[PDB]
């Protein structure tokens, strides 16, 4: 809804629009663009905007696993997704989707080059949200590994884009927002990622988030699923409601994982569902049906 909200900014912990009103963005993430980028096009995004009401779309560009590092032509899919979002007036998250490569320092030079290119192209576009490191994991912690990565990537972005929102992943697959909160970045327009799976993470993770907010650290849910953390194991609707009620209570934006026909509980679509949208309810999974309901409201 950027044609409505325009330039985003941060008031305290609260994401606000260009009028200065609080906004809660809701949407869905691609699966890895090198495998399911076939579902990410102007058509499908327009159908998501119109039929699901998404106000944000996430372009999950894996670095490892046949992603950008081995095949950088996938960056054309991210550009495709950003141009679709500009046409359609929705926010787009450019997600440098580290995972197997758990320390963001591992692909740091390529990250900085990639974000220099994206910020250069899209830096004066209000649609764009940068996610610089999906899920730091392994022996990887905030003060030692992630913050100093973040500073370097943020300096390069800010040369081209002084004001769009940058979201920074946190330790333990973006759970340890408490540690970021203890040693925050100075950037005015920075938020910290939190990720949960309704089948796995309960109150300890909410506690961490409330603690981070209490320190003034903004939180954005760039990825959450209705399944357990493997992305499979069925759909946990009661826990997913509990979690969404918690995010509503703090007005926290969220993006569900994932838009694809991957045969696991967390995929939104059944196999055979159109790459260009127009899905009926009977074309959506249990998870997709629930998610679309909650994006609509």
Structure description:
The PDB classes it as hydrolase. Keywords: alpha/beta barrel, hydrolase. It forms a monomeric assembly. The chain has 297 residues and is an alpha/beta fold. It has one domain (1-297): Glycosidases (TIM Barrel, Alpha-Beta Barrel). 38% of the residues lie in helices and 18% in strands. The chain is built from 11 helices and 10 strands. An 8-stranded parallel barrel has the order 3-4-5-6-7-8-9-10, surrounded by 5 helices. Helix 5 (108-122) runs parallel beside helix 6. The protein starts with a helix and ends with a helix.
Beta-strand content estimate: 15-25%
Based on secondary structure, the structural category is alpha/beta
Radius of gyration: 17 Å
Overall spatial form: globular
Number of strands: 10
CATH architecture field: Alpha-Beta Barrel
Domains (count): 1
> Helical region count?
11
- What would you call the quaternary organization? monomer
- CATH fold call: TIM Barrel
> Biggest sheet, in brief?
8 strands, parallel, barrel
Biggest sheet, spatial arrangement of strands: 3-4-5-6-7-8-9-10
Question: What is the H/E order?
Answer: HEEEHHEHEHEHEHHEHEHEH
PDB class: hydrolase
Keywords: alpha/beta barrel, glycosyl hydrolase, cellulose binding, hydrolase
Assembly: monomeric
Entry title: P212121 crystal form of the endo-1,4-beta-glucanase from Bacillus subtilis 168
Describe the SSE topology:
Blueprint: H1 2-5, E1 9-11, E2 14-16, E3 26-30, H2 33-36, H3 42-52, E4 56-62, H4 75-88, E5 91-97, H5 108-122, E6 128-131, H6 142-160, E7 166-168, H7 171-174, H8 177-182, E8 190-197, H9 203-214, E9 219-225, H10 237-249, E10 254-259, H11 286-296
Parallel strand pairs: 3-4, 3-10, 4-5, 5-6, 6-7, 7-8, 8-9, 9-10
Antiparallel strand pairs: 1-2
Helix pairs in contact: 3-4, 5-6
